[PDB]
Amino acid sequence: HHMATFTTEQAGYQMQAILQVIGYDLLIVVTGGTNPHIGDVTTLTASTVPETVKFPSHDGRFHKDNFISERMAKRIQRYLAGSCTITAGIHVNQITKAQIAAAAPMTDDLSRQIISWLQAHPVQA
Amino acid sequence: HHMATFTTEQAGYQMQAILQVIGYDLLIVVTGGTNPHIGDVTTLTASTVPETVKFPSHDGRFHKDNFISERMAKRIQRYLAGSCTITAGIHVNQITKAQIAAAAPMTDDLSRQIISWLQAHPVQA
Ligand SMILES: [Mn+2]
Ligand SMILES: [Mn+2]
């Protein structure tokens, strides 16, 4: 009804998106790899430019999981009934080159599943 | 283990906080009243100033649920092992004056429950 879970696995590691509908608004939690976390949080509505918070990681640098959160936002923006919040934290120990390139097709694959679920479950009752 | 739910009810309406631990990081979803939603999203760590996104509501104005999200952030900041994300959407149809004043004691009551749970479940294994 108001909660769904989507997974995908390419190049030997998994990514998961957990979606929650609250009122007309959406919360999506994206994780994967060996160490799930919350690295970045992207915020948007259907007719608003997305904003992203990047949390600090180590050595003065910031988490780069916003590649995932910002791409999923662009893919699903047109379908938003209200606000949308996307958290992302994907990390694979000793990640490989083929694994890095698979991050974008995996985000698209989850985005497509989310979009299908939204069309089958109109947030308007 | 990694998920807990806290409720409180004062002046005849309820507020709920759902907490999720991901890695070392926290996601807290606060709702209540007749129409739960996601109005505002506050982001912080233990030694960082909090930032808040205010989503648009109606008539060019913005949701004011950040009163709740920003107060819960201040209450629990010292206890944070990593990043923290707090969403808030509380709305009561024809809210009353006693109900408005109860918003702050209710947020404190949830914050105290969250803090107790974090101390009993150290995010470090
Ligand atoms: Mn990260
Ligand atoms: Mn609101």
Numbering used by the authors:
A (entry chain A), B (entry chain A): -1 to 123
The authors write:
Previous studies indicated that the small protein LpdD (lp_0272) is associated with the UbiD-type gallate decarboxylase LpdC (lp_2945) in Lactobacillus plantarum. The crystal structure of the purified LpdD reveals a dimeric protein with structural similarity to the eukaryotic heterodimeric proteasome assembly chaperone Pba3/4. Solution studies demonstrate that LpdD protein specifically binds to reduced prFMN species only. The addition of the LpdD–prFMNH2 complex supports reconstitution and activation of the purified E. coli apo-UbiD in vitro, leading to modest 3,4-dihydroxybenzoic acid decarboxylation. These observations suggest that LpdD acts as a prFMNH2-binding chaperone, enabling apo-UbiD activation through enhanced prFMNH2 incorporation and subsequent oxidative maturation.
Despite multiple attempts, the crystal structure of LpdD in complex with prFMNH2 could not be determined, because of the difficulties associated with maintaining the strict anaerobic conditions required. However, LpdD crystals soaked with MnCl2 and prFMNH2 did reveal the presence of a metal ion in the electron density, coordinated by His35, His61, and Asp63 residues. Major conformational changes were observed when compared with the non–metal-bound apo-LpdD in the F53–I66 loop region, containing two of the three ligating residues. This region is highly conserved despite having no obvious structural role in the apo-LpdD, which may indicate Mn2+ binding could be relevant for activity, as is observed for UbiD enzymes. Structure elucidation reveals LpdD is similar in structure to a eukaryotic chaperone involved in 20S proteosome assembly, with a highly conserved region exposed at the protein surface. The latter includes a metal-binding site with possible relevance to function, with the conserved H35–H61–D63 providing a Mn2+-binding site. The coordination pattern allows a fourth nonprotein ligand to bind, possibly the prFMN phosphate when in complex with the cofactor, thus resembling the UbiD Mn2+-assisted prFMN binding. The presence of MnCl2 (Mn2+ is required for prFMN binding in UbiD but not UbiX) in the reconstitution buffer appears to have no noticeable effect on LpdD–prFMNH2 binding. Furthermore, WT LpdD prFMNH2 binding occurs in the absence of Mn2+, which suggests metal binding is not essential for activity. Given the LpdD conserved surface–exposed region largely consists of loop regions that are shown to alter conformation in response to either metal binding or single-site mutations, we suggest that the LpdD–prFMNH2 complex likely has a distinct conformation through induced fit binding, hindering accurate modeling of the complex on the basis of the non–cofactor-bound structures.
